[PDB]
Amino acid sequence: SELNRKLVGYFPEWAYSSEAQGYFNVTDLQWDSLTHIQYSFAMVDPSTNKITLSNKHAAIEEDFSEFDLNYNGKKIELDPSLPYKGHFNVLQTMKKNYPDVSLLISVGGWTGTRCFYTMIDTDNRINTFADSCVDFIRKYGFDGVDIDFEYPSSTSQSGNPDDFDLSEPRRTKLNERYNILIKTLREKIDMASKEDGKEYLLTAAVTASPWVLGGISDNTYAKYLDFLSIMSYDYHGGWNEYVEHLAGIYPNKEDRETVTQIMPTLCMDWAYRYYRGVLPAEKILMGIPYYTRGWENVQGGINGLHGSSKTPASGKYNILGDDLNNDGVLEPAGANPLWHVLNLMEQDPNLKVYWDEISKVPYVWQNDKKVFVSFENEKSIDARLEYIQNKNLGGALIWVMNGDYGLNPNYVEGSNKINEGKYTFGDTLTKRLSQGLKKMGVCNKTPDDLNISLEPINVDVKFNGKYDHPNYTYSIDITNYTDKEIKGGWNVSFDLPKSAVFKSSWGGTYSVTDNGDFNTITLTSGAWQNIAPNSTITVQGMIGLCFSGIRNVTFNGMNPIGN
């Protein structure tokens, strides 16, 4: 059952009362197509270090008397026998008719990560938080916990700048403490599963940014997750000048932001290769956006793409813009749900859609106003399905579910009101994904690393290093725990994810052999590099770009099992 394809959707707690979000509530979720629903979002309490609700009223108090709760044309009433109302009541009520859809509480996000920084400071606070997550999923009928820490990285000035006062003093330890957090959550959740006779889940949404990942050395935490959701979006946007795709699939040598790097990194497939260092494909999910980012007054490019702009798209091209000071004056971002862009194209014949066959995503370009907005449509869904099948991926996650589209019951011909266009939210793309995931069948089980099938040798191989972008300097310690000297000319091999390129060994010689999502690096030492019994020898070299970890380590054609 763990090899089943997954279609994971984030539910926005905030949407049901917001015009720009379409007033999307739980009865608008794509229940027939999703396998998992991630409730966005919970946080960590600053004083108790326990899981806590963001909008408590929305989550457990709202009666929706002023809103339209209906599903399949039938009015949905809150279950009066539950001791809470809100979204959580509607979720549990719907779950009765969709018992195989898993519900998870997502903790964190861009604005909910702040108190993670102080909670991870001590093991007792981590224990308190993990225990509180168990209490919470029991109380509210959740099937698991999703951790969306943005970001547990040493990279200076990553994460929300509002939190620099907490993150910057902690950079050197965040990755280590995050690994303890995830491991502790797994331990507590597994115990609760046994106690309750339920199979509770632990998942995480994780960065796809090479910049953030340069400060994330230990990715062992991934092995404690039921699945790892790659946030393969927000690659490009109004924060800089590069008019490029929000969520490209394949590496694009024409992406101006990375044209000089050793390979194009701002695409799903680069992050896939990165995380293959620690996970099989069937535990990795592709992130899919149902929103846009964009620019206006675009200079150069072709249909805007690969042009430049210092002015993100504004006005009707930015209905999801953040309102920083409640003026109704939204920060330019070119950010829209997909249905709004469809409505804009109904009204403007010169707002046209184009296809990028390299990145395999669409984009929208207004040639008179010079407006470029990223996009997502049936063609990109089909390309994403092909990728998921080709790579044996676990499936996809969607950010956020109210951006999919369908026909609007409140359509008014000629209206420019946000919720009176031809389209509103719907399930067009999500149903198409679900159908394609069904058609391709379950994932294959990725075989174990081949090294475990080899004869053992009592040699310990330890791979460490330091990243100074774009250079990874590795140091490998090889300890001979046998009772005989190992002669020089020994070789060690390891599989290096194709997110990185082996550059040089500083001693001996090396070969590079293609091995799927990896290159097998074989380092052959010189005759003088004898390893005495109970002694350690260290070799170094250089790798370009970063990687989640290395795999399939061998020594002299055998499995190094250390001591």
Ligand SMILES: [Cl-]
């Ligand atoms: Cl179901």
Ligand SMILES: [Cl-]
């Ligand atoms: Cl297209």
Ligand code: NA
């Ligand atoms: Na394709």
